[PDB]
Amino acid sequence: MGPGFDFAQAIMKKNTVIARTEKGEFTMLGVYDRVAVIPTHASVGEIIYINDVETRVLDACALRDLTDTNLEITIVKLDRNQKFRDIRHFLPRCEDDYNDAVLSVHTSKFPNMYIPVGQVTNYGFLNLGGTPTHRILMYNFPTRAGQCGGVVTTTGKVIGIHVGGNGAQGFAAMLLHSYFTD
């Protein structure tokens, strides 16, 4: 509808796949080469389904900060025959607050879905389903199940992936440039 949804649409059309684990279907952001991200609570194993194709997982890493605290981001390398568009230059280098964010989801259940979530707070510490979690972004949208993995963008930046909510607010794990330095 406007330049926010334009940027979000550009990311969704080239840099997302539908990931299926034993914990369900997720939006999964491809970042560069065969490297993608997903909420750690997806519990990625040896094999994953990518757009309903059985795919071997070459590597999976559950990120923790240097305090040894959960970040809820799993970096996954896929045994796929095709590379993602490199979007590492759209990742912010620092933790920050942002205005006018969009949350974008694509699954079987929620295809071509885009939500204007508005202002995004650098929230920091969250007890997420009982797990101490750091580097959390918060937006005042009553987000629901099916939306985890969803991509949080501003015009020009990909800032995080949706990992939960409480019925009033939604929560995203920050993406930072430094996670994907090869």
Swiss-Prot record:
It comes from Human enterovirus D68. It is found in: Host cytoplasm. Residues 2-180 form the Peptidase C3 domain. This is Protease 3C. Interacts with host IFIH1/MDA5; this interaction inhibits host IFIH1. The active site is at residues 41, 72, 148. It catalyses: Selective cleavage of Gln-|-Gly bond in the poliovirus polyprotein. In other picornavirus reactions Glu may be substituted for Gln, and Ser or Thr for Gly. The chain holds residues 1549 to 1729 of 2188 of the full protein. Major viral protease that mediates proteolytic processing of the polyprotein. Cleaves host EIF5B, contributing to host translation shutoff. Also cleaves host PABPC1, contributing to host translation shutoff. Binds and inhibits host IFIH1/MDA5, thereby inhibiting the type-I IFN production and the establishment of the antiviral state. Cleaves host MAP3K7/TAK1, resulting in inhibition of TRAF6-triggered NF-kappa-B induction. Cleaves host TICAM1; this interaction allows the virus to disrupt host TLR3 signaling. Cleaves host IRF7, resulting in inhibition of type-I IFN production.
